[PDB]
């Protein structure tokens, strides 16, 4: 809004449409699911404006789906009707702290009727605690926040594919009708010029058989197919005649080992493809088949009829014949052509609302099954709607989705941007969609229809390239699940503000200009040649009056995270992709500063996320502690915003919040009152501005490494706070109950000196490896209580305690201060899982300073580890004495081909040393003063729009007019370079260096976690080998490639030692350690246990595998 | 070509002392239990090897067959039980060769005794050529 | 370790490997969490579950070494024997090995000339087959 901080923008054109809510795709969909008041408001608002909207909420129609249910005879019936919600039992924070699910009770009016008697009995049924989504878009389940990512799937409809028989070099065409939930019928032609249907992926049969399996007869078939050779030929090849034999033979092929009967075959067909229950060609599918085949207005909630299959036959045989245009079956004029699988009419988005709808549908189907069982099994006059409804299926189905699905997964809370863009993904790898290996190329490649809907640049850098994506900045999910993008209606060549949202299929019929196309005071176009993106991804200029639409914004194509990057057009897409990916791993820092040079996108990105405390209504601030902000509203109410302080995240960071307003400030609705982690004044701040000089330096920033001054360690510029939880549970074993007791058995007084009276460590204490975070004791251990030991104890007179010390301890390699303790117990009202009596969760916090080993990065994919931290004097310094903060190799910039970081550096220096270019009558100065960036005070933050940013010439010109510091000192020359000095010798460097301010991000790849070491530790069960994973103190996988390497070296004894002694030789493993600790030769290896298990396994496979000697049986 | 192809196998059996009668099984060995362990998972659960499920299937059907033989059941029932025992041992040795696989807890197929030897993750290519080792460490790499 | 050979496993070889017969389709008691008897994970046929112990407890004392108990039938020795000790199950109806039959063509037997479909029918009790004919007496 107007209250955003000051940032000077270089934009030369004005976008008439502002970026919509960056979480609408989730919250609107889930409002449609619950059908709450917001969705009704949206529906009526859309109806007023004459848009297209879903008039039926998600659960309304789902209960309608399972509405009519009856027993065998239907003597009685059960129906469901209007549903509604009760307010949640707990608030969101209550759920977060107490390990609950943020859910609201759902209540429906289930009606039971006895049709023979005519009696109707209504009763309100508890349908369960439906989980709700937070305002952000996350869901709180079992104490943790989670995101349900929308799925990018193939839309239901009819696809007409083509291919080439390579052996015969012959055209082949195929047709396939996809349902929302039913089964397919693959229909192939031109194999031998012989059309053939394939039902349920069984063996193919001729069309004429199945078409004879319905009312159609041979005479009518020839009547309305009397022109196409292929199907006449199939009919001649057809042997079965008449309907009944057709049903019998389709039953035989589909269902072998079964009696052929008319009734069974008719029932099978009707159940499989013509039953509104088993087969669902939803309104998305109904619309697709209506538009493709031209079928005119069938039952909008219908299944495939005869007409659909006959229309597919007509279309496919006309594809074979070479026809290109025709009149669709009972409809308008369609074009005969083959369609793609990557196009964005042939792909759709299953949002969170529709996903939860599907899962509720499965749960209600199982509830319907149980209700039918109880309907037939039980008797009338004692049956009420409650009496036969079991809602456990529904509850378990929702829990299954929110606990096990691949599309519902933990929020990425590394920083506000990572969480925000976790909620704009368009995932493909998941249930009902593609897979890692099945996916080929054309799905993993950006399509001309991705423009404005899916981000070309943001994408995983691993196996999931092209599968997991990200919604564009202006994307809007259609009712049917397609994405739409806005476009200004260019009416007779004069632009207008009338924005129409178009999808890829309606986009491929129009000529689309560019937002940066030159335009005059009158909205008519200026230049004759106006470049346009035309159908098929074919850029091709036109007169201008010909033009029909224009892009609303020149960053419509880009996503949010990639829109962060300034000077994106000066980078190759590879490094832009890497930079956008790695910007999400940025740790939040103690003190956060928004970038000195950035895009006009940090404010809206942070505001539309959920880490920035905003104002619900206008008013005035009253009380501002660090923990809360109390405001007196202008409507006469009060609101107290409680702020989170050093709260652990899913990834171990902190969500500390800091206030922005003082206790006199006039607030407005939407204004930011406090900032979340990695935010400054409601503007994202993922890293810090560092002074960088591009140069080699004594081989320390060689090969992409990084050198930075010790200033950043002293000042805590790149420091962070990380919190680790150590949860322990007190069980009840067979021998008794476990208790959390301070008096640990047989320990020294100092170890538990820092333990509370209840056994837990004291808050504020500092912990090192081996420190007892929580003291616990087993009730006893059946270790030595044999009659011998019993006699020994009886004679002793002292019953030696047999308790096991299971005290929770700090994992080795961790330190910090105990920031918190939480205790759940069974004696109190706190819920616990069956078996555990007490649950102690201790939070230990630590401060990480940037050290040699960490990983820094910029917004251009320019990442490198930290190699050296110089004393502040050793680092090169400018003329007036200021040292530079970081040293980056200039080799990477041209070879990696990302010359946008140098532009960022120059503009950062330019912004730090503000300029004054008012009234120069030069072109760059003229542009900067007409825009309004001619005068800029030092330290001002500047905005570089991702396609309307600062020009290279402007940067150079401004560099000449940078406000001086000492007299007219302008350390940086117009060449972009400054004269530096050698901090280790003092001599000036031979030539100027390029210096300036660049935003450096501290990535969550932390050196502390990666350091993994082992001498001995946990082995595996079947194979007596070291286990994997760091937390297990695991070993390192010495793959077979390494065995090849050691064999090539000829290192025989080393390979033997490390294949047997270092792993998988029990006696060798024990004796090598014994020999080293005592001091002795390492023993000769033996037989690996892996070999023993191998021979036993293949013996169990009944192979007499005997290790034989040349004189008999060789030692096992 | 067919004659020489068959002659390969016939000569293989002829030259060696191992008789072809080993190709039909009357006893099935059971792999030692510790190679197919079941362990108490927290929450009162048990994580067990798929081999236990397959052995349970074959023993179930063998015992039911023995009962059916004792009662002198008709030919059809004993034939069905013998066919089922055959399919059970087939799944025990290779779950995927014939018919649909025997799924375990989820929809995923169970693990056969021969599925533990082949594949990328089999015994040979995951535990005998490449092993996790002691006295080993790792960390990020910096330039000195 | 001069060589390592594999051939066919006869019935006698399998019986020679084994120490007892698995007769029950039961692994352990869900309540007391112990091996059952003559089932999978059994302790009489496989090794003791605990070092130097036996099922019933008469020789739970560690002093005994290698003797056989007189009530449960579990010998007293180390608990690692369960990695090595094997058992068998005697089938009532003989069955074919899915490897040596119904497998890769060159190893599909061919000792008895039969198409894959014919063996599919014979093995899975769907068609009969003659094992003997008195041709001389028939003539």
């Amino acid at each position: 809004a107007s209250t955003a901080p000051l940032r000077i923008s270089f934009a030369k054109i004005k976008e008439p449409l502002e970026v919509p809510n960056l979480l609408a795709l989730q919250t609107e969909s889930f409002d449609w699911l619950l059908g709450n008041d917001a969705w009704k408001a949206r529906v009526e608002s859309a109806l007023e404006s004459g848009q297209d909207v879903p008039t039926k909420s998600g659960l309304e129609e789902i209960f309608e789906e399972i509405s009519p249910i009856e027993d065998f005879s239907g003597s009685m019936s059960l129906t469901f009707r209007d549903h509604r919600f009760e307010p949640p039992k707990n608030s969101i924070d209550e759920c977060k702290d107490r390990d609950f699910t943020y859910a609201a009770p759902l209540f429906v009016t289930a009606e039971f009727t006895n049709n023979e008697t005519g009696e109707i009995k209504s009763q309100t049924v508890f349908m369960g605690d439906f989980p709700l989504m937070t305002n952000k878009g996350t869901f709180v389940i079992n104490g943790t926040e989670r995101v349900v990512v929308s799925q990018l799937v193939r839309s239901p409809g009819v696809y007409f594919d083509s291919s080439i028989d390579k052996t015969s070099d012959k055209d082949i065409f195929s047709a396939k009708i996809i349902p929302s939930r039913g089964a397919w019928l693959e229909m192939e032609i031109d194999k031998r010029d012989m059309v053939g249907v394939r039902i349920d992926r069984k063996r193919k049969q001729s069309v004429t058989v199945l078409l004879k399996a319905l009312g159609w007869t041979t005479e009518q078939i020839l009547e309305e197919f009397g022109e196409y050779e292929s199907m006449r030929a199939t009919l001649e090849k057809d042997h079965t005649q008449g309907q009944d034999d057709a049903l019998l033979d389709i039953y035989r092929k589909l269902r072998p080992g079964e009696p052929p009967t008319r009734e069974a075959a008719q029932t099978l067909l009707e159940n499989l493809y013509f039953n509104p229950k088993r087969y669902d060609l939803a309104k998305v599918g109904r619309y697709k088949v209506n538009k493709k085949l031209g079928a005119d207005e069938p039952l909008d909630a219908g299944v495939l009829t005869t007409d659909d299959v006959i229309a597919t036959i007509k279309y496919l045989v006309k594809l074979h014949a070479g026809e290109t245009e025709t009149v669709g079956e009972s409809g308008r004029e369609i074009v005969v052509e083959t369609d793609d699988i990557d196009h964005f009419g042939n792909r759709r988005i299953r949002n969170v609302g529709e996903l939860i709808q599907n899962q509720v549908r499965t749960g209600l189907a199982r509830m319907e099954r149980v209700v039918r069982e109880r309907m037939t099994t039980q008797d009338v006059e004692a049956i009420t709607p409650q009496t036969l409804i079991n809602i456990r299926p529904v509850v378990a189905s929702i829990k299954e989705f929110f606990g096990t699905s691949q599309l519902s997964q933990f929020m990425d809370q590394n920083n506000p941007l990572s969480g925000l863009t976790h909620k704009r993904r368009l995932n493909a790898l998941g249930p009902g969609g593609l897979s890692r290996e099945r996916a080929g190329f054309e799905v993993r490649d950006v399509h001309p229809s991705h423009y404005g809907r899916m981000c070309p640049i943001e994408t995983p850098e691993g196996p999931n390239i092209g599968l997991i994506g990200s919604l564009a900045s202006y994307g809007r999910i259609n009712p049917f699940g397609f994405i739409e993008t806005p476009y200004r209606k260019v009416v007779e060549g004069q632009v207008t503000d009338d924005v129409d949202y178009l999808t890829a299929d309606e986009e491929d019929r129009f000529v689309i200009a560019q937002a940066n196309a030159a335009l005059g005071d009158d909205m008519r176009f200026a230049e004759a040649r106006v470049l346009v993106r035309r159908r098929g991804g074919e850029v091709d200029y036109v007169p201008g009056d010909d033009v029909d639409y224009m892009d609303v914004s020149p960053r419509q194509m880009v996503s949010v995270a990639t829109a962060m990057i300034p000077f994106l057009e000066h980078d190759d897409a590879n490094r832009a992709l890497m930079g956008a990916n790695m910007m999400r791993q940025a740790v939040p820092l103690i003190k956060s500063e928004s970038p000195l040079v950035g895009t006009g996108m940090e404010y809206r990105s942070a505001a539309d996320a959920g880490d920035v405390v905003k104002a619900e209504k206008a008013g005035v601030v009253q009380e501002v502690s660090a923990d809360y902000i109390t405001t007196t509203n202008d409507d006469g109410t009060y609101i107290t915003y409680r702020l989170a302080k050093f709260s652990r995240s899913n990834q171990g960071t902190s969500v500390n919040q800091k206030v922005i307003v003082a206790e006199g400030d006039r607030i407005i609705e939407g204004q930011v009152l406090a900032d979340g982690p990695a935010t400054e004044n409601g503007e994202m701040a993922l890293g810090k501005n560092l002074l960088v000089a591009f140069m080699p330096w004594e081989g320390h920033n060689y090969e992409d490494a990084i050198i930075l001054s010790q200033r950043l360690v002293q000042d805590d510029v790149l420091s962070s706070i990380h919190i680790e939880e150590h949860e322990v549970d007190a069980r009840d074993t067979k021998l008794g109950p476990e208790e959390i007791t301070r008096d640990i058995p047989n320990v020294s007084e100092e170890v538990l000196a820092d333990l509370d009276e209840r056994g837990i460590i004291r808050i504020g204490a500092e912990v090192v490896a081996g420190d007892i975070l929580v003291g616990k004791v087993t009730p006893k251990g059946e270790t030595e209580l044999t009659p011998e030991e019993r006699l020994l104890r009886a004679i002793f007179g002292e019953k030696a305690r047999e308790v096991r010390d299971t005290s929770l301890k700090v994992p080795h390699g961790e330190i910090g201060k105990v920031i918190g303790v939480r205790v759940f117990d069974r004696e109190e009202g706190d819920e616990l899982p069956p078996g555990v009596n007490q649950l102690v969760r201790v939070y230990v916090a630590q401060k990480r300073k940037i050290t040699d080993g960490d990983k820094l990065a910029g917004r251009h994919g320019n990442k490198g580890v930290i190699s050296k931290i110089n004393p502040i004097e050793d680092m090169p310094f400018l003329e007036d004495g200021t040292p530079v903060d970081i040293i980056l190799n200039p080799l990477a910039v041209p070879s990696r081909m990302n010359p946008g970081q140098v532009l960022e550096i120059h503009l950062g220096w330019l912004a730090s040393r503000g300029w004054d270019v008012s009234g120069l009558a030069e072109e760059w100065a003229q542009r900067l003063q007409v825009i309004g960036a001619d005068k800029v005070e030092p330290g001002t933050n500047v905005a570089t729009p991702v396609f309307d940013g600062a020009r290279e010439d402007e940067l150079a010109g401004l560099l000449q007019h940078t406000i001086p510091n000492r007299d007219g000192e302008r350390m940086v020359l117009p060449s972009g370079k400054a004269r530096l000095f050698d901090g280790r010798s003092g001599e000036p460097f031979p030539e100027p260096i390029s210096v300036g301010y660049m935003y450096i991000l501290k990535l969550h790849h932390l050196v502390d976690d990666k350091l993994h070491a082992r001498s001995t530790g946990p082995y595996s069960m079947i194979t007596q080998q070291p286990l994997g994973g760091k937390a297990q103190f695991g070993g390192q996988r010495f793959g077979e490639m390494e065995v090849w390497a050691l064999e090539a070296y000829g290192a025989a004894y080393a390979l033997q030692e490390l294949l047997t002694i270092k792993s998988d030789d029990v006696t060798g493993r024990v004796k090598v350690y014994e020999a080293i600790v005592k001091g002795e030769n390492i023993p000769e290896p033996g037989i690996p246990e892996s070999f023993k298990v191998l021979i036993k396994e293949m013996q169990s496979l009944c192979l007499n595998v005997e290790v034989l000697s040349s004189d008999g049986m060789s030692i096992e | 070509t067919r004659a020489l192809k068959r002659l390969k196998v016939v000569s293989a059996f002829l030259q060696t002392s191992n008789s072809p009668k080993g190709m039909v099984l009357d006893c099935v060995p059971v792999i030692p239990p510790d190679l197919r362990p079941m362990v108490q998972l927290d929450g009162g659960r048990f994580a067990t090897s798929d081999l236990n499920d397959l052995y349970r299937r074959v023993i179930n059907r063998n015992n039911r067959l023995k009962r059916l033989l004792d009662l002198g059941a008709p030919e059809i029932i004993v034939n069905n039980e013998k066919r089922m025992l055959q399919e059970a041992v087939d799944a025990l040795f290779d779950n995927g060769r014939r018919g649909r696989p025997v799924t375990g807890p989820g929809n995923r197929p169970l693990k056969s005794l021969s599925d533990m030897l082949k594949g990328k993750q089999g015994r040979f290519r995951q535990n005998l050529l490449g092993k996790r080792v002691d006295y080993s460490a790792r960390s990020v790499i910096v330039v000195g | 370790f001069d060589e390592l050979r594999i051939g066919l496993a006869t019935a006698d070889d399998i019986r020679q490997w084994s120490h007892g017969e698995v007769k029950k389709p039961e692994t352990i008691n869900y309540r007391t969490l112990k091996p059952e008897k003559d089932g999978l994970f059994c302790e009489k046929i496989f090794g003791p579950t605990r070092d130097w112990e036996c099922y019933c407890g008469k020789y739970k004392r560690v002093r005994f070494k290698g003797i056989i108990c007189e009530r449960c039938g579990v010998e007293v020795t180390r608990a690692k024997v369960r990695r090595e000790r094997m058992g068998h199950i005697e089938l009532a109806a003989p069955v074919t090995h899915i490897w040596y039959f119904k497998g890769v063509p060159s190893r599909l037997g061919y000792l008895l000339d039969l198409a894959p479909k014919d063996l599919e029918k014979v093995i899975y009790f769907a068609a009969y087959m003659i094992t003997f004919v008195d041709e001389e007496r028939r003539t």
Partner: peptide, 26 residues
Amino acid sequence: QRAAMRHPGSTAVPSDEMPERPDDSL
């Protein structure tokens, strides 16, 4: 169903007994 619903804890998952469960004696 009776035999199934009672104590349904035996999950035949070899991805926890082998990889995640280590030997008690190291």
